Ligand binder design. Structure first.
Ligand SMILES: [Mg+2]
Ligand SMILES: [Mg+2]
Ligand SMILES: [Mg+2]
Ligand SMILES: [Mg+2]
Ligand SMILES: [Mg+2]
Ligand SMILES: [Mg+2]
Ligand SMILES: [Mg+2]
Ligand SMILES: [Mg+2]
Ligand SMILES: [Mg+2]
Ligand SMILES: [Mg+2]
Ligand SMILES: [Mg+2]
Ligand SMILES: [Mg+2]
Ligand SMILES: [Mg+2]
Ligand SMILES: [Mg+2]
Ligand SMILES: [Mg+2]
Ligand SMILES: [Mg+2]
Ligand SMILES: [Mg+2]
Ligand SMILES: [Mg+2]
Ligand SMILES: [Mg+2]
Ligand SMILES: [Mg+2]
Ligand SMILES: [Mg+2]
Ligand SMILES: [Mg+2]
Ligand SMILES: [Mg+2]
Ligand SMILES: [Mg+2]
Ligand SMILES: [Mg+2]
Ligand SMILES: [Mg+2]
Ligand SMILES: [Mg+2]
Ligand SMILES: [Mg+2]
Ligand SMILES: [Mg+2]
Ligand SMILES: [Mg+2]
Ligand SMILES: [Mg+2]
Ligand SMILES: [Mg+2]
Ligand SMILES: [Mg+2]
Ligand SMILES: [Mg+2]
Ligand SMILES: [Mg+2]
Ligand SMILES: [Mg+2]
Ligand SMILES: [Zn+2]
Lengths: 98, 51, 159
RNA sequence: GACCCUGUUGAGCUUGACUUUAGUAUGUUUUAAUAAAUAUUCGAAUAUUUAUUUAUUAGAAUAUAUGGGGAGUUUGGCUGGGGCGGUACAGCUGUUAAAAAGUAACACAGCUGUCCUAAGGUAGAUGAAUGAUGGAUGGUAACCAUCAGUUUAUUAUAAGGGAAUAAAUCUGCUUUACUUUAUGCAUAUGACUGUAUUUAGUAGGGAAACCUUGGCCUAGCGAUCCCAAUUACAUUCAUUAUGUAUUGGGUGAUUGAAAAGUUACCACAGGGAUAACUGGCUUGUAGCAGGCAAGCGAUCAUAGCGACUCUGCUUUUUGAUUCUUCGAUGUCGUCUCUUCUGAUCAUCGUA
RNA sequence: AAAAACAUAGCUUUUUGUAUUUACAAGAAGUGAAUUCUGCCCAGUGCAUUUGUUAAAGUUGUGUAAGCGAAUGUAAACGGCGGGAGUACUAUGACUCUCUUAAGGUAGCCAAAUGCCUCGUCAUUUAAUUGGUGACGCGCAUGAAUGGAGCAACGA
RNA sequence: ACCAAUCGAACUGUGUGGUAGCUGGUUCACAGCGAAAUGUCUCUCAGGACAGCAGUUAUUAUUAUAUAGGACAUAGAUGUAGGACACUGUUAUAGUUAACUAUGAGAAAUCUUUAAUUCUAUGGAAUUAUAUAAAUUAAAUUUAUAUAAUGAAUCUAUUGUAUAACUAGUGGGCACAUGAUUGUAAGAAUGAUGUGCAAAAAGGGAUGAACCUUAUGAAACAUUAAAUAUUCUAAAUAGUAGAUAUUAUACCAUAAAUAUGAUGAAUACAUGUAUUAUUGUAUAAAAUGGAAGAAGAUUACUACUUUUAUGAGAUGUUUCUAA
RNA sequence: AGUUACGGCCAUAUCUACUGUAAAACACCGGAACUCGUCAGCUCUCCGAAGUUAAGCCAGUAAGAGCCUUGUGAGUACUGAGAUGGGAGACCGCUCGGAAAAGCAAGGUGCUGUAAUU
């Protein structure tokens, strides 16, 4: 699947169409001051393990998240596409019958 | 199980007609959900200037 | 034949013989007002606005008129009772329900008989539909009618 | 009922099942003072090593590894009995299916966890597949003209449906693969999902009417808690944390526990809702007979046999089903002894 | 359930030179008198020996662990020890070619308490044998201290 | 193997009235009313919850200007039996100058076609005059809303209809008639429509959960239904004719391919040869002593009609008890 | 009474052969200086009026193919309700109701709305 890097869409803050810029999305690294880690750090000071881990899974590929960005607002939007195995952005377009 | 019977549809019709079959009355028209919103606003304005 | 939106439609959503193609202009010129009577017939050449296959051929009433849809009210038979359904369809799937035309003519003509009897002192002689009772009497003539003798006939094999 | 099955009932035992622990190995910090030597870092800080007596009860607190020597617990469902095999455990099309709607089988033939910045949107132009007759090298089959050509061709894919001024092939231009108020249909007493329709904006194609909320339509569908990202704001002050809204990370047993075996040393509650033996309905298999007559018999169908086909009986083999017995009806063979059937091995009478 | 099971002497491997006891001693394992033998394999799993990855505590700051991984030995440690084609009246194949592997069952033994087809083939024992004994071997699935071969004495 | 008649973890007291989706039991009379064995979800299949079926109490009348497991009149939807070889799949042979013409066979996943049946909707409201709008149009121009007036119009039945609140049992079903799928077949397995047994009395099928007559308090008298009239056993051995075989049952408790006889039967042909209808015998073999219900019957068997009589909480007449 | 511009229903309006039409109209027809389009003024686009009724449009003929309609087929096939009717079975017969197609004959070959011109 080939995806472009420039898309001109409606922006809600400016109330007009404006050229956006497209980038991929990756899950960032978690931290230990969030409340889910402070509970789990103090529960685990007991002999054994207290919370389950998922062991059997069957999915193969994940969905795609995008990031459009208005230059005037400097504010980001998020959009979603279907599942795909090979994702390349900004490639060279198709050539008609050569 | 003992590979029992899966399921039938016998006397479904007999249990229905025990107390009759009631017909739910449609009310007055222009009151059912889904009327055009542009049509309803003009109907409201026409009644206020009447009375 | 699993549970989907368009299951088991082979002879219900097939266009008949020597009648393929996009519909004509006489469909689009018709108008609908609130309170009429409308039957539903699916034309299987457009794919925007088709109802479910259960409602093919049931008559309802029109209560709303939108820029792209018409609203029809019906009755469905859910397990015990008779409920109320509403659907929005396009204009290329409807048909004007006849059957009140002989009734609405009788309303207009009885309303004229009531008007002419106001100027007189007589009682009203309304128009109502006829009744069929016992067989009436008739008169036959034996001047030109001669009876024909009928009897049995012996059996004859076909070969 | 000890055999067999069920129970979200147990116990003894093993191990590359899940989760841990006694014992033990190795770091760091605590350790008598003194003098000297050596090394490593920049006069100073660390480390190593020797000597003396003024200490010398011999240990303590933490971290990583090893650890069936031990300790708890688990080891799906459907099923013509269970196991082995398959998944009929989630979605989609045609037939079973009996001219409104609805409907079963470890019944029939199949498909699905994908592909696409164009295979999405719009404007315009256009006789596709094939056949006939001809044209230097040119042949069954290279390319060019003429005539015919009702859908045979194509439309990402399973099957069904639709489309001939075309939804197909080309040429141009674009990102509606949008943001916000309300409602319906599968469909219900009911979540999640798919898909039609509306109020107000902002855009693309076109001369304009008009079309456009992803693929011509019916499939590629995932809650609570927690984690990551985006947009608004909230407190004496900075940074952080917590709240409301939207997406992504996932449970294929698909409306969703975190999980390997064995018992012939075995235990408990129950089950004829369910097997191993007798009985009962059935006769594929087994056994015993019939009808017709191509031919064999030195010529002659029927002295004696009989191919290709067709119609029966019996309960004497072996199967198919699970109606009665699981708070018990003692299995194979042999020894002894009585009686019964004709489909007669001799003995009797005929042909 | 008295035996073909256990024990036994005999044979072999291993740990310890700071033992109230002191290596002709003290702990841990396997086979099972004597005679004759004890073949090949360290790729896998274990065991031993020797120079990329990895926690906490401390210091203005920085640095340094065992273990795992890699190399070399070890099978009287757990264990394992193939298949197809042509070639000297018929027939067979001393000899040759070829897939791979860690190595491709050697000395011996047998339808044996170990052979499904199977009541294997030949001889002998009997009037008559699915029994017994002696020979044969492409051995479903024999085989060397998980011991192979063997009977003098002894046996409810 | 042994550790006090106990050992694959001894014996005594306590936590303890340990938990059980699993067996067993559950105590007085009469009266009113009366079911389900089906759909969806479930580490769910010997169990649960929601929906359906039931009971009790309450308020209210043009929701009789209304309703109906009905009919009639009108307007419609459909692709199953039958039909066809024209489209898709299939098949045997002869002709004429690859194309046309014939006689034959066909379809659960084929259609130029197309019934009986099943189902949906209308059978009373409509017109006139005046007004309102911020919708809509080139426009009083339409789309909508008010107020006033003008009305009972298809046959039959129903004196009530409608609305709330609270709560139990059940979720293993089986049989007959009609028509189907798998299987050689089954008192086999699994679906569709109606009625039953479960939970239903009396009379008849000799006996039998489901077959045939048939609606319900305690009794007496007359009339029938289903079925029977030699005797057991209440009720006429009340008629025409045929059957020679120990003949004779609606569900129902078995008989075939095949070979041959007989009628004062019929038609064709030369007293007889051919067919057709009715009917008899052979084919026809089992395990303790046997089943038309039995004794026995040839006028107690079989076929077709009319009278008479016997015979059910049925149906009529009289007495009495239940809100 | 026919044509010509917009149409509604969409074969009685299609297909293959021959034959005919006065006026007006509709066509064929003559060319690329400009707008536009190609390899090619073939098509499309833009200016014209010498010639021609040969074709197209319109109307006719055919024991013509195709479509539309009436009769026969036929009370035949089939089917809703029923009985202690018949058969070893496969199935068939009866009572009260509903009711077909394919063929085989006879006949037909567009009807119409608003406007304009002879
Ligand atoms: Mg369970
Ligand atoms: Mg346990
Ligand atoms: Mg354990
Ligand atoms: Mg099971
Ligand atoms: Mg497309
Ligand atoms: Mg779409
Ligand atoms: Mg589920
Ligand atoms: Mg044992
Ligand atoms: Mg027990
Ligand atoms: Mg049973
Ligand atoms: Mg027995
Ligand atoms: Mg046989
Ligand atoms: Mg006994
Ligand atoms: Mg006993
Ligand atoms: Mg005999
Ligand atoms: Mg002894
Ligand atoms: Mg003893
Ligand atoms: Mg021993
Ligand atoms: Mg030895
Ligand atoms: Mg090694
Ligand atoms: Mg070695
Ligand atoms: Mg050898
Ligand atoms: Mg030996
Ligand atoms: Mg022998
Ligand atoms: Mg003891
Ligand atoms: Mg009652
Ligand atoms: Mg029980
Ligand atoms: Mg309930
Ligand atoms: Mg009809
Ligand atoms: Mg019961
Ligand atoms: Mg009775
Ligand atoms: Mg009987
Ligand atoms: Mg008597
Ligand atoms: Mg009497
Ligand atoms: Mg009575
Ligand atoms: Mg009575
Ligand atoms: Zn912006």
């Amino acid at each position: 699947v080939n995806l472009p890097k420039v898309r001109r869409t409606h922006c809600a803050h400016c109330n007009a169409h404006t050229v956006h810029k497209v980038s991929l999305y990756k899950k960032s690294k978690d931290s230990e001051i969030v409340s889910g880690a402070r509970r789990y750090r103090l529960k685990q000071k007991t002999i054994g393990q207290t919370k389950p881990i998922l062991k059997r899974k069957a999915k193969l590929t994940k969905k795609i998240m995008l990031k459009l960005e208005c230059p005037k607002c400097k504010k980001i939007q998020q959009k979603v596409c279907k599942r795909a195995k090979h994702v390349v952005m900004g490639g060279e377009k198709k050539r008609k019958n050569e | 199980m003992a590979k029992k019977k899966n399921g039938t549809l016998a006397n479904k019709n007999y249990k229905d007609h025990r107390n009759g079959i009631k017909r739910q009355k449609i009310g007055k028209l222009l009151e059912l959900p889904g009327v055009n919103q542009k049509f309803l606003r003009n109907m409201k304005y026409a009644r206020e200037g009447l009375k | 034949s699993a549970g989907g939106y368009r299951r088991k439609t082979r002879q219900l959503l097939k266009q008949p013989f020597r009648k393929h193609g996009t519909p004509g202009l006489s469909v689009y010129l018709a108008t609908y007002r609130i309170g009429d009577y409308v039957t539903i017939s699916i034309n299987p050449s457009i794919h925007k606005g088709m109802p479910f296959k259960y409602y093919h051929g049931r008559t309802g009433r029109v209560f709303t008129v939108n820029p792209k849809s018409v609203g029809v009210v019906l009755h469905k038979k859910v397990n015990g009772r008779l409920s109320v359904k509403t659907i929005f369809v396009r204009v290329e799937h409807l048909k004007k329900y006849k059957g009140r035309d002989a009734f609405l003519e009788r309303v207009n003509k009885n309303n004229e008989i009531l008007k002419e009897a106001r100027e007189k002192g007589i009682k009203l002689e309304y128009i109502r539909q006829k009744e069929e009772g016992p067989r009436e009497e008739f008169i036959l003539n034996l001047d030109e009618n001669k009876p024909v003798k009928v009897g049995y006939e012996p059996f004859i094999k076909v070969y």
